[PDB]
Design a protein around this ligand. Structure first.
Ligand code: HEM
Ligand code: HEM
Ligand SMILES: Oc1ccc(-n2ccnc2)cc1
Ligand SMILES: Oc1ccc(-n2ccnc2)cc1
Lengths: 300, 300
């Protein structure tokens, strides 16, 4: 077996041109090939401009349309994603001009607003600036945009056991811990390679389904993966879908009763129909990363 | 003399409760004693929960923090390890929820990525699921994560003489032998007691220092030892440090010239300083095991 690593790690220098160029050329071919027999002269013109740009700046910028295509192909290329059957139902937010953690926060607020849509969940991805030298990365330190804290004496955990470590990190970063079963964690946002800053999510932005005391948030958003395309790496690119029912009877009932989208049969059929409507190593690809608190060099 | 065996062998049944319990109790004491005079009520609460768990499930689970403490104390307890002077400089990856060999492979990929760190080596250990009945062991059959193959007519060996036997095993397992001096061996990974599966390491994951033709890999990682803690046994727990210069002038020069960490005086001083920064029979312990191809019962 020759599996590939599903993880893409940090860099300390820009991707070498002899490495970047072949990957860019190949992505551009994939993009223009999606037009089948059309746009040969456009394809060649784009190859030229991208090459000059790489040779002159050391890197290159995707067009918006190339970016959109890439986010959708990367989704189509996600082996375990059940939602990838309707990969054309994806809203893209272009945050590649983002500079600060405060601005990252506002972009994420918009994403959560749009995607949650009062319960009528819509799939979205927000793409922050691409990796340059690897010393100025944008990262979300959260695993998901919305997730409950987990607190550890008897060895048992209150909250989400999966967030024990990250929760402790937020505390260490000055976040004030409640100790409930359902405390929504703050966003921990890193911009331009700087130390991360901590932002509470406005509670009204968090839609929850009450199930006994049980409760859960409506929006499943992956915060911590990296988008690769044409040799470019985007270490900050949160995306969301909607929940599968499986990840109990009460749950399937409560989401449906509160009108929050889940992947039931009707939704599967509806979203696939909408997908077919739009019809009028793997790359690009979403990689896992190393948890950033294990690799970050603190400014202070 | 009453030396202890440095080897810990296989089991065919779970550790008996009358044996496990005293060891768990003692480890918990060691863990809470590291808090000196604090957390007496927490200590007692943990003793209770661990005992009930052992009595009800036949075993118990460490908290993440207990696991981390154990990996570091086991390192501190390693008699021949020169690096143990800075035992607090250890990154822990928790893979105790691993199920398959494919997943083991991805965890090891992450470990190699993190630890190699483009040459700025960082010490890490990845802990796979603990032994249950001894019939579902996770094992790495390699002695090191990265090591060159050794090929034997005149009785001389091409490659690493220390891997003659394991190399032959990989071939028997269907791995296609080149016959160079520096062929990186595949990972041979056993999950849940099943027959091992063979995985080529992605070449880009392997950092090498070119010294004449001489060459060598940057990352020294022990693949085949067992971590013991509180009566629990972890038969798969690869860890790495960085090389000592001694294990030639050209070598010390080439690593330093390519910026790959070795235990020179500066590094010794730097890592010890970082260690002191963190300051704000033996158990736990790393045991040797019997080479698994000598004990494994083939499913097919
Ligand atoms: C519209 C609803 C969607 C559904 C129902 C869905 C469902 C899932 C499920 C069930 C998994 C597997 C998780 C596990 O292993 O337990 C998954 C993984 C994943 N999803 Fe989605 N997803 C959706 C949208 C998206 C979107 C919009 C993207 C990205 C543009 C995406 C990218 C991924 C990736 C990269 C993974 C993990 C890697 C892998 O699949 O191997 N998904 N998704
Ligand atoms: C950071 C750099 C490190 C250095 C320079 C270092 C160096 C060494 C050396 C020189 C040996 C002796 C090998 C021989 O006998 O020829 C050794 C053995 C060993 N090391 Fe390390 N080591 C490091 C990190 C680690 C880590 C991270 C662990 C585990 C968490 C570890 C655990 C051991 C064990 C168990 C042995 C063999 C048993 C024994 O010491 O008797 N070492 N190490
Ligand atoms: O913990 C999570 C959350 C959301 C996930 N997801 C959303 C869309 N696709 C996967 C996956 C895993
Ligand atoms: O053959 C090896 C490789 C690495 C080793 N090591 C790494 C860290 N500590 C020991 C020891 C022996």
């Amino acid at each position: 077996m020759n599996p590939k690593s599903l993880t893409r790690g940090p860099r300390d220098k820009p991707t070498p041109l002899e490495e970047l160029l072949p990957h860019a050329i190949e992505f551009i071919n994939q993009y223009y090939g999606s037009f089948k027999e059309a746009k040969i002269e456009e394809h060649l013109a784009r190859l030229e401009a991208v090459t000059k740009e790489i040779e002159t700046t050391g890197t290159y910028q995707l067009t918006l349309d190339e970016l959109i295509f890439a986010t959708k192909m990367a989704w189509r290329n996600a082996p375990r994603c059940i939602g990838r059957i309707q990969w054309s139902n994806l809203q893209v937010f272009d945050a590649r001009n983002c500079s600060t953690a405060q601005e990252m926060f506002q972009h994420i607020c918009r994403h959560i607003l749009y995607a949650t849509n009062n319960g009528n969940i819509r799939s979205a991805i927000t793409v922050f600036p691409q990796r340059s030298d690897g010393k100025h990365d944008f990262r979300l330190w959260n695993s998901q945009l919305i997730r409950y804290a987990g607190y550890q004496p008897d060895g048992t955990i209150r909250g989400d056991a999966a967030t024990l470590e990250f929760t402790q990190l937020c505390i260490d970063l000055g976040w004030k811990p409640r100790y409930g079963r359902f405390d929504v964690l703050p966003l921990v946002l890193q911009a331009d390679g700087q130390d991360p800053e901590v932002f509470e999510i406005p509670p009204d932005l968090v839609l929850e389904v009450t199930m006994l005391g049980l409760k859960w948030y409506a929006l499943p958003a992956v915060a911590n993966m990296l988008l690769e395309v044409g040799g470019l790496e985007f270490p900050a690119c949160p995306f969301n879908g909607w929940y599968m029912g499986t990840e109990n009877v009460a749950v399937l009932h409560s989401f449906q009763k509160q009108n929050v989208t889940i992947m039931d049969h009707h939704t599967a059929s509806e979203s696939f129909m909408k997908h077919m409507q739009n019809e009028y190593v793997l790359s690009p690809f979403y990689y896992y990363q190393i948890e950033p608190w294990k690799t970050h060099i603190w400014q202070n």
